[model samples]
Target: MFISRHSGEGKFLFIDQRATLVIGFLPQEILGTSFYEYFHNEDIAALMESHKMVMQVPEKVTTQVYRFRCKDNSYIQLQSEWRAFKNPWTSEIDYIIAKNSVF
Candidate 1:
């Protein structure tokens, strides 16, 4: 599980312990980094499309299947559920959440 600010291309805000174990990256290494950095180059386009879909409808969960680069420099297929959360007062996207698992 992970939460990222909607700005800076989904910069990571928080990530759970399980996420670190699964993705093989330390908290310090992931925090404050753009999520795009970990996505496999070939899958970036698909991931961006999914991100746009999720942002278009607040709270709507958009599913994306892509490859993520692990610490070992290998890629793993991940099925990610993405949803955008809005700031009610501003009607702007506050953050995004992603629930990822191996596919």
Candidate 2:
């Protein structure tokens, strides 16, 4: 599981222990980093598209299958559920949360 900023570069804010088990990277190492750095090049465009969709419709879950770079530099397939949370006061996205499973 991961929590990230909704705007700008979408830098990660929090990553769970399960993320380390799945991606082979410590949470500290991933914090403040953009997932774009770990995503497969060919899949990034699609991810961006899905991200935009989720951002546009807060609370709607968008599921995507994509490849991520592991600590060993090998790519692993992952199916992730993405959703944007809105800030009730501002009606703006506060952050994005995702749950990832190995595929």
What TM-score against the true fold does each predicted structure earn?
A: 0.84, 0.84
**In candidate 2, residue 102 scores what lDDT?**
78
- lDDT string for model 1 (27-90, tens) is 8888888888888988898888888878787655655678888889788888877788777798
CA lDDT of each prediction against the hidden true structure: 0.75, 0.75
**lDDT: worst 10-residue window of model 2:** 1-10
For model 1, what is the error of residue 56's alpha carbon versus the real structure, in angstroms, after optimal superposition? Answer: 1.3
Which segments of candidate 2 are over 4 A away from where they belong?
1-8
lDDT of model 2 at residue 26? 89
Give the backbone clash total of model 1: 0
lDDT of 2 by residue, 5-72 (tens): 43434688777656677788887787778888888998999988887788787565655688999999
Q: What is the Cα-based lDDT of residue 17 in candidate 1?
A: 66
